[PDB]
Design a binder for these strands. Structure first.
Lengths: 77, 149, 134, 116, 50
RNA sequence: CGCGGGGUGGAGCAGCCUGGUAGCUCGUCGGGCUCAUAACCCGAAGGUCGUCGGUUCAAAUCCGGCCCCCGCAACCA
RNA sequence: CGCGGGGUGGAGCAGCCUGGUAGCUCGUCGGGCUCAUAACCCGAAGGUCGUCGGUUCAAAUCCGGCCCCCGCAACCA
RNA sequence: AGCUUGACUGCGAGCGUGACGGCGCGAGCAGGUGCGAAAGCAGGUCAUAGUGAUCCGGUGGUUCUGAAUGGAAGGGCCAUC
RNA sequence: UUGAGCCUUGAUGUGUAGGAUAGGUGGGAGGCUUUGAAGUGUGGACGCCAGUCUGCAUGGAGCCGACCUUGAAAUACCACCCUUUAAUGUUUGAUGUUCUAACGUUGACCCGUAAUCCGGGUUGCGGACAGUGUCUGGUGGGUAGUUUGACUGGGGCGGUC
RNA sequence: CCAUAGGUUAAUGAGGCGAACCGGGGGAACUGAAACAUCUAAGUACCCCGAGGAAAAGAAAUCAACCGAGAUUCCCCCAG
């Protein structure tokens, strides 16, 4: 499923308003991307399905610290 | 990214400054190689106290050792046996690891990833000047000899 | 290519850091020294449009120290120029008179003029550099 | 500017015109003049006198470069071909060696049947 | 029609205005009439406006 | 309505640029010339260089108002 | 039956639209070139603007009756 | 033909005409104006067609309001597109 | 490399009158020179090619403002800028080329594993392209929702409102 | 190479069902507008996931108003 492994941004639905306000159900998809992250302690690579903003959270927080949060919820990376 | 370095990046690296680089440049290169580290108050504390003292020179002590690795083989002319055909044009297109397993068998304990071949992948037969990578600017030019069997 | 005398004068002036009204009057004596006593001219840069007929600003001012009646009329640039007296006088004399100048300039403030009026007012001596004050 | 010392003049003399250009020894052109741009529209376009002023107006525009000696490579038959070099001799240049580079085929493609 | 409507603005400080039409293609001069002004209650001249 | 820039010899256009320079092609006439229309060439007549006012030693150019025109995008009373 | 368009020298077409001045080509007539005809060169004439009436200072033009020609329509059962 | 701007502002008893919206006439009163010596006349044109309701929005004037207060934006009111 | 803005600084700009390849304006008449001068040698920058400018130097310590014909005064000194422009610093952008770490890999090989899925690891090939999300111009009957008037000697056509 | 992935065994919990209610994730149209596109119908029907006996929300970066009140939830007014 299109779910960011870090932030948990699932696809949300909204409308696709035209000029004449003709609403038509559209869906917003999170900017997901598979990326190979490097964990310093384990000295191995970890590929996660992360959103662009999700990379910044892995950037600001400790990469292993956010990995700690993932195993806290019980989802293997 | 306001990353603080650990090594001598050849263009903006002075071992320890807190320069501003693009996000990709750090997360894909400097970090996974150990050349630098994203500036955190915690590791900066461990920098101007623990790392900037002698840990800074710890990386450079083996750098001088690789300067000797620059000349493990004093002869600088390694002979390798290779099968070929008439008028040059050898049997098979060699690889860089062809040099790796031959030179370590007769001298320099080198690996595949550090030998640089500026002249294609050597399709020409004779004596050519291949280069090694022991440092960022320190280069050794060994002339390997591929002669027809 | 410039000569000796004017060389040190521009070297005495930091062309980017524009000075205060308090000590800029004292900085013109840093420039002036000749066989005859010079006078200070005030080049007032205004942000009005000179191509329009509705923005012709000019008038006369009776300066309390003289040199006195001083007239002025803007050019095809939107910048007007005036002089206020000889530089060999009192420092505070030079201070208070130019203050009355921008008051007189705001006296004839155009109604069709858009934007901040006083752009960059620079005072300068006959044989010295130009110093703009805030 | 570049101040090129030597140069090679080229002359493309056809039956209805002549376009003389002046280039250096490396082939990169540095200016030209035609008999068609010197006025001469029609019958006068294919005349040796028109080839004369073409060599003169090409003697100019190359002044920025000021070339001393000049190699001459004339090409094709026609009304100019000779009055363009004599005019270029008196142009002031130093004609080094004159050659004929006419494109003669060895019975290649077939020429038209036109003209009656 | 092709007769443009104009704005007859007052002369006094008040912004009171009269409104009427005018064929500019025929009469190229501006109107300078005299009409009543209700906020000061007097008769002043009125000038052209768009 | 808001915006952009033009009126230039019988026609269009350049010159508007950073202000002092009315030229080119087709057209009319006369002439040279060929068998001859034409091609070619010389010269002349032909323009308040939109209108008024202002700035200036000088404006068709700069500036303001305006007549008209072509084009652009918008038009949910 | 109705809609739209048209009727202009001898022929074939413009100008009607937004009223005051009718042009292009061929043709016709006179002259020239040629032994002569054609072609070519030069000059000129020729139009009740379908017809009648009205509105208008003025009607080929705006409007209506009528006549002729052309296209469309003339339909569902 | 001379002189001028009543093609005026605030109202308007009493009537006509319409299902209604709405349209039309109007002596007279107050301020002030033009013309005339004066009495008086003028709030368009001999009269009857020349024109569209509302919503929304634009421009100008008016502290009427303006969500804690002082202001402002935005509304209301008037003129007007 | 190449555009643009800007800063410092050096240049840049001949109707005609005329010694002047001078834009307006502007305070005022001394600057200039021995922190090595007028004249000239010579190359260059600019060039409506009229006459500016200029590094080094024999030389050697001078040069010249109102004065004059001008609408103007002399870049002798200096100020704010208009045009044209040059070196530097700086700021980002648009292209070109190379590289490898992101990414792709429906290439070969090895392992999980007797599995042409897949995941991982060597290596090779591309390569910051591609592809994906968000915003956005165009196209869009492929698709969906609908509109498509009334009067009328029945309706349609014509005409009317 | 180490290490992990993978694999075997033991221990514990879960799965399905159930009338309505409850929270969250997706989400119509007929219809009204005397047509219809904004709008309404309605975040209703319906589908899905999860939970309890109730569930939800909940102890103010809440209002109020220059005087004060004090979490949430439900009902009657406020008020068509």
């Amino acid at each position: 499923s299109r779910v960011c492994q870090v932030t948990g941004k699932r696809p949300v639905t909204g409308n696709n308003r035209s000029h004449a306000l003709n609403a038509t159900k559209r869906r917003f998809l999170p900017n997901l991307h598979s990326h190979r992250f490097w964990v310093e302690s384990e000295k191995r690579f970890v590929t996660l399905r992360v959103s662009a903003k999700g990379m910044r959270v892995i950037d600001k927080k400790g990469i292993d610290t956010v990995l700690a949060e993932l195993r806290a919820r019980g989802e293997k990376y | 990214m306001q990353v603080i370095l650990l090594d001598k990046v050849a263009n903006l690296g002075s071992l320890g400054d807190q320069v501003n680089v693009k996000a990709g440049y750090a997360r894909n290169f400097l970090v996974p190689q150990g050349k630098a580290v994203p500036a955190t108050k915690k590791n900066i504390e461990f920098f101007e106290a623990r790392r900037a003292e002698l840990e800074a020179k710890l990386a450079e002590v083996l750098a001088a050792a690789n300067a000797r690795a620059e000349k493990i083989n004093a002869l600088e002319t390694v002979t390798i046996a290779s099968k070929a055909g008439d008028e040059g044009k050898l049997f098979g297109s060699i690889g860089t690891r062809d040099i790796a397993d031959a030179v370590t068998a007769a001298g320099v304990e080198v690996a595949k990833s550090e030998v640089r071949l500026p002249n294609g992948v050597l399709r020409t037969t004779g004596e050519h000047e291949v280069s090694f990578q022991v440092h960022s600017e320190v280069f050794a030019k060994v002339i390997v000899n591929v002669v027809a069997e | 290519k410039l000569t000796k005398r004017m060389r040190v004068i521009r070297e005495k002036v930091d062309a980017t850091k524009q000075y205060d009204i308090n000590e800029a009057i004292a900085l013109l004596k840093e420039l002036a020294t000749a066989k005859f006593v010079e006078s200070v001219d005030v080049a007032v840069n205004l942000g009005i449009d000179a191509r329009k007929s509705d923005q012709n600003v000019r008038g006369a001012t009776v300066l309390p120290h003289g040199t006195g009646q001083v007239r002025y009329r803007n050019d095809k640039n939107g910048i007007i120029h005036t002089t206020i007296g000889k530089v060999d006088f009192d420092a505070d004399k030079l201070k208070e008179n130019l203050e009355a100048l921008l008051v007189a300039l705001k006296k004839a403030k155009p109604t069709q003029a858009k934007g901040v009026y006083i752009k960059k007012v620079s005072i300068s001596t006959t044989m010295g550099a130009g110093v703009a004050v805030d | 500017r570049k101040q090129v010392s030597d140069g090679v003049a080229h002359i493309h003399a056809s039956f209805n015109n002549t376009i003389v250009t002046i280039t250096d020894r490396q082939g990169n052109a540095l200016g030209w003049a035609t008999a068609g741009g010197s006025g001469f529209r029609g019958s006068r376009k294919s005349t040796p006198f028109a080839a004369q002023v073409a060599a003169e107006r090409c003697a100019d525009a190359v002044k920025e470069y000021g070339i001393k000696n000049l190699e001459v490579m004339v090409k094709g038959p026609g009304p100019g071909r000779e009055s363009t070099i004599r005019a270029l001799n008196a142009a002031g240049f130093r004609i080094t060696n004159i050659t004929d580079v006419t494109p003669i085929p060895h019975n290649g493609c077939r020429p038209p049947k036109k003209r009656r | 029609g092709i007769r443009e409507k104009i704005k007859l603005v007052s002369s006094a400080g008040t912004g009171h205005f009269y409104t009427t039409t005018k064929n500019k293609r025929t009469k190229p001069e501006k109107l300078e009439l005299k009409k009543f002004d209700p906020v000061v209650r007097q008769h002043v001249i009125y000038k052209e406006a768009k």
